[PDB]
Write a protein that binds this ligand. Structure first.
Ligand SMILES: N#Cc1cc(F)cc(Oc2cnc(C(F)(F)F)c3c2CC[C@H]3O)c1
Lengths: 110, 108
C-alpha cells in the first residue's frame, strides 16, 4: 500500500500558496479550503511551535530536506499524524524570495 | 514572453523515474496532461543526446539525495523539444523524487 501524501507550496511564513488535490484523500479538505491559510492553523497546539521553528530553519539549510512530524486536524475532525518533508527552491537565474516545497504524508506514530 | 515562475512546475516520481504526479502548469508549457504522464518513465521523454547524462544525474541523485540536472531537452506533446533544467530531491522515510522543473526555452 502506498502511504497517502500530497504536495503543497508555502511562503516562508507558512501560508499555503499551492495544494496538490491528493490532499482530499489525505486530510479531507478541498485545495481551496487550505489555499491562503497558514499550515499552523491546522496543527495541534502542542506541535505549532515546532512547526513554526521548522519553517524558519528550512530556509537556512541551503535547499536540503527538513522533516517534521505533527498532528494535523482532518476535515473528519481527527488528529492525523503527518510527516512533512520540506526544502526551499530558489530559481538561480533570479533573486526572488525562496519558497518552500512540501510533501505531506499520513504516517504512524508507534 | 512568460515569467520564470509561469515556467516552473513540479513533478513527483517513484524511484524508477515514473511520474506519480505532475502540476497542470505543464499543460500550457509542453502540452501533456498530467493524467497521461503517470506510470511512464521520464526516460521516455529525454532527447537521445541527453539520455546518458540524465542517467548520470539520476545516479548522483540516488546516491547523494539531491541534484541539479543542468540542461536537457524534453519531447513536446505536439512535436519538437523544449529545453529544461530540473532540480531533484529524494524524500526518504527512499520514498519518492520531487522535481522542480524549469523551462529554459522561451514560452509565449
Ligand atoms: N523529459 C523530461 C522530464 C521532465 C520532467 F518534468 C521531469 C523529468 O524527470 C526528471 C528530471 N530530472 C531528474 C534529475 F533529477 F535527474 F535531474 C529526474 C527526473 C525523474 C527522476 C530524476 O532522475 C523528466
Amino acid at each position: 500500500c502506498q502511504p497517502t501524501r500530497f504536495i503543497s507550496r508555502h511562503n516562508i511564513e507558512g501560508i499555503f500558496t499551492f495544494v496538490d488535490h491528493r490532499c482530499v484523500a489525505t486530510v479531507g479538505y478541498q485545495p481551496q479550503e487550505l489555499l491562503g491559510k497558514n499550515i499552523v492553523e491546522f496543527c495541534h497546539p502542542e506541535d505549532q511551535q515546532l512547526l513554526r521553528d521548522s519553517f524558519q530553519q528550512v530556509v537556512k539549510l541551503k535547499g536540503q530536506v527538513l522533516s517534521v512530524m505533527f498532528r494535523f486536524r482532518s476535515k473528519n475532525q481527527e488528529w492525523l499524524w503527518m510527516r512533512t518533508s520540506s526544502f526551499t527552491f530558489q530559481n538561480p537565474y533570479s533573486d526572488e524570495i525562496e519558497y518552500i516545497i512540501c510533501t505531506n504524508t499520513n504516517v504512524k506514530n508507534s | 514572453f512568460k515569467g520564470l515562475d509561469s515556467k516552473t512546475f513540479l513533478s513527483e516520481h517513484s524511484m524508477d523515474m515514473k511520474f506519480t504526479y505532475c502540476d497542470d502548469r505543464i499543460t500550457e508549457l509542453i502540452g501533456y496532461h498530467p493524467e497521461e504522464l503517470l506510470g511512464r518513465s521520464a526516460y521516455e521523454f529525454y532527447h537521445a543526446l541527453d539520455s546518458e547524462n540524465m542517467t548520470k544525474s539520476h545516479q548522483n541523485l540516488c546516491t547523494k539525495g539531491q541534484v541539479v540536472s543542468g540542461q536537457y531537452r524534453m519531447l513536446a506533446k505536439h512535436g519538437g523539444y523544449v529545453w529544461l533544467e530540473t532540480q531533484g530531491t529524494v524524500i526518504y522515510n527512499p520514498q519518492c523524487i520531487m522535481c522542480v522543473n524549469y523551462v529554459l526555452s522561451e514560452i509565449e
